[PDB]
Amino acid sequence: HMQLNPESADLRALAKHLYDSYIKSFPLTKAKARAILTGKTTDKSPFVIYDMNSLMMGEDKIKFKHIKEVAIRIFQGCQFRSVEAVQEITEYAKSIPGFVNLDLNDQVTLLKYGVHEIIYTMLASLMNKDGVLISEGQGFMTREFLKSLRKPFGDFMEPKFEFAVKFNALELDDSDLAIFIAVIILSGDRPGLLNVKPIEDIQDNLLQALELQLKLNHPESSQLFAKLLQKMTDLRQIVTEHVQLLQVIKKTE
């Protein structure tokens, strides 16, 4: 028996606060990314990297913010963008009500253990079965071109694609993702937190806001809320595997 009452309006106001902050912190939204991927935009058509020749041509014709071997140059562009993403996600976290009022050490811990889960959530927005938008939508690198990179680089992005194809089938929008990402950041189970209860209290309010968002926005998926908590569980495992690949790479390359 859902009612539009003061409590529900406050949850819609929190949802709008997070959406507006998400738009401010993250230049390329899912709406704009999907417009590019489906050829439904007036913006510049991305240059497609689908083989070694189009990569060499792309390095010139795509304008990257960053300044030997192909696989390593690609991994380094990936590393640079990931640094920029940590800054954007941090800027977003500072807008979540209650976050900057937590103990700084806890804010740092929440971001340290949360940013990779948010990175692969937000990468799904930029992905389809064919490939991924790069350079803020100026380029598109294919999934199979990435898989063709020599070991250990060929298997670096493939689990993120596998996750994305299933995640994107839920058809979440930016209003949904803004709350989803805030729920992930305010996880009271991160290792080494000092003060868990104030994190859980914020997360409880974000979970209420998410549940209401998904009921209003997704009339034909009654258990989408449960499905998204399932994905947050899956992202844990994905990031475990990702940090294992990073160790191999940092060590051996």
Binding site: Q87, E91, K112
Partner: peptide
Amino acid sequence: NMGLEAIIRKALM
């Protein structure tokens, strides 16, 4: 990890 913490503290300040 030390790198990641350093960037987060920088972005937070």
